[PDB]
Structure 1
């Protein structure tokens, strides 16, 4: 694991592979790091240069950082990719990392970012149960309750050892400060855009987006309708038990990313 100072903050990352073409850039969700992509990584790096990126405050340095959100996540990873002289690249973002993935796509254009894959991101407007949990993890006294309740629904009774180990053992060293911030940023993201589908339609020059998921349940039909209206959009339900398709089904998700890049 290596680090750079980007925008005055410490960004940890991983740089593997030398195949030519667009670079895979992995972006995790809130309160976990590039180990979310340990399963996919052998397949990704065999295919393309692969850069796994941590968010600010998520690297080995677990000091509390200044408050930040989606605009900073985007500017940090862009500044990192500029420093690494990465040209065109394809973000792979887990759940609400997709908000930053889309902000990055929107900032650089379709030629510098020709595709984006998103993993298990709520595509409807935010359910009220969700918003309720986004406020419970902002609760100093009961943020742990909120997390366990989010986690338990993310697992959905799974037996997949990789997903179990990642949630139980591989996301330590975070607390109220980061979980409350995730509550703040995810809540404000739905409040501002309505939904990530609305977020996508606001892209001036939409690149190729693919949403890969196992958890929403409502509707694939909302996806069919979105794909039928926008040729740049695709999607695939994976059939996994969990909220973590990249960890539960790493080869299949990698195959999807390699497919998405091939098309674009």
Structure 2
């Protein structure tokens, strides 16, 4: 992209997006999920580019040139993200995550505190403990014989029977160059994160300093899913959700306008005390 930079972060060389917009805070920090890069945010960046400083960190072995790296998890993602934020001299940021980027967002909210990271937005992140089908997929991702088969079953779930041109391009073209190294790592970390933390909702409830977090999602579409978000929202003043009605698990791609108004609303709220 026009905005794609690269820096040394401890051992590893990481690419990141930085639009270097010279404007009022907070910074908008878009956090990739596993085994994809800033390319998932190219439509979202367009919505935000003019009115905000937009930062997109790419994880170790993630970017236009995927490469094998030493095993790491979401704690390393936080430190990696914070190291890029120190080098860019960014203080106050609004983290916005996609899917299992959420583990990075919540740990980041903890480690940075409510002053630097006063709110967060989590997009299409499975709020409940893995269901058998998702549990099955992590299995396949972790198996060096069937990891690719694992990715294809997930692609089926994320597209939800839609011929959605932009999302299909993301999955089959922009994730094509990611291998078992990444997809195997993704299965290991996400499985461990649900195992260790219970769920995203347990992790968020467990924060030392609870904060405005909004879950914005299109999937899953079933009533039972909306109710756990609704019940959690009832129990926690700080939690809200928005069902975006988009066709796929990638609203950043297929309803970027809708993603942006929620991001903008949280950005506005931050700018006003």
The TM-score bracket by the shorter chain reads over 0.9
Query: Are residue 173 (structure 1) and residue 177 (structure 2) matched?
Result: yes
Shift of 1:61: 4.2
Structure 1 unpaired stretches of 5+: none
**Retained in 2: the 8 A contact 1:120–1:212?**
yes
Aligned twin of 2:164: 160
TM superposition shift of 1:123: 0.5
Work out which of the residue numbers 225, 244, 258 in structure 2 matches 1:238: 244
Distance 1:219 1:128 in 2: 15
1:193 to 173, 192, 197: 197
**Cα distance between partner residues in 1 of 2:136 and 2:119:** 33
Q: Tell me whether 37-46 or 196-205 shows the greater mean CA deviation.
A: 37-46
How far apart, in 1, do the equivalents of 2:104 and 2:214 lie? 15
Q: Distance in 1 between matches of 2:263 and 2:245?
A: 17
Q: SS in structure 1 opposite 2:115?
A: coil
Please tell me whether the aligned partners of residues 65 and 177 of structure 2 are also in contact (alpha carbons under 8 angstroms).
Answer: no
- When normalised by structure 2's length, the TM-score is 0.94
Aligned to 1:47: 51
Q: Tell me the equivalent position of 2:10.
A: 7
Deviation at 1:37, TM superposition (A): 0.3
Q: CA deviation at 1:46?
A: 1.8
Q: CA separation in 1, counterparts of 2:106 and 2:8? A: 23
Equivalent in the alignment of 2:116:
112
Indicate conservation of the 8 Å contact 1:109/1:207, yes or no: no
Which residue does the alignment assign to 1:258?
Answer: 264
CA distance in 2, matches of 1:228, 1:63: 44
2:36–2:63 Cα contact (<8 Å) kept: no
| 1:29 corresponding residue in structure 2 | 33
Count of paired positions: 264
* Per-residue Cα deviation, 1:86-139 (whole angstroms, up to 9, x for no partner): 010011110000100111011010110011111100001111221111011111
CA distance in structure 2 between the partners assigned to 1:60 and 1:158 by the alignment: 26
The answer (yes or no) to whether the contact 1:47–1:258 under 8 Å persists in 2 is no
Pair 1:132 & 2:166 matched: no
* Offset from partner CA, 1:181-200 (integer Å, 9 cap, x none): 10000000100111100000
What TM-score does the superposition give when structure 1 sets the normalisation length?
A: 0.97
CA RMSD after TM alignment: 1.1
How many angstroms does 1:157 deviate by? 1.7
